[PDB]
Amino acid sequence: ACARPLISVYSEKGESSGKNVTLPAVFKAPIRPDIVNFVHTNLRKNNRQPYAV
């Protein structure tokens, strides 16, 4: 969508501090598990070592 909420920054003790950051527009991008799978299963082959007899 287009509505970007106001996320709260938490302190190291677990409680909320006074700082608020608006939600980045990255988190409203479309969810495409097919493209994530296509990118993952093609980029995961790039760290492979060759094997041969």
Contacts with RNA, residue ranges (CB under 7 A)? 1-6, 22, 27-30, 32, 34-35, 37-38, 41, 43-47, 49
What is the C-alpha separation between 37 and 31, in angstroms, rounded?
A: 12
CB of 28 to RNA, least distance (A): 4
Helix, strand, coil percent content, the chain, rounded in steps of 5: 35, 25, 40
Closest to another protein by CB, 21 vs 31, is 31
31 binds another protein (CB under 8 A): yes
Report whether 23 contacts 3 (CB < 8 A). Answer: no
Could you say which of RNA, another protein, none residue 52 binds, taking C-beta under 5 to 8 angstroms by partner kind? none
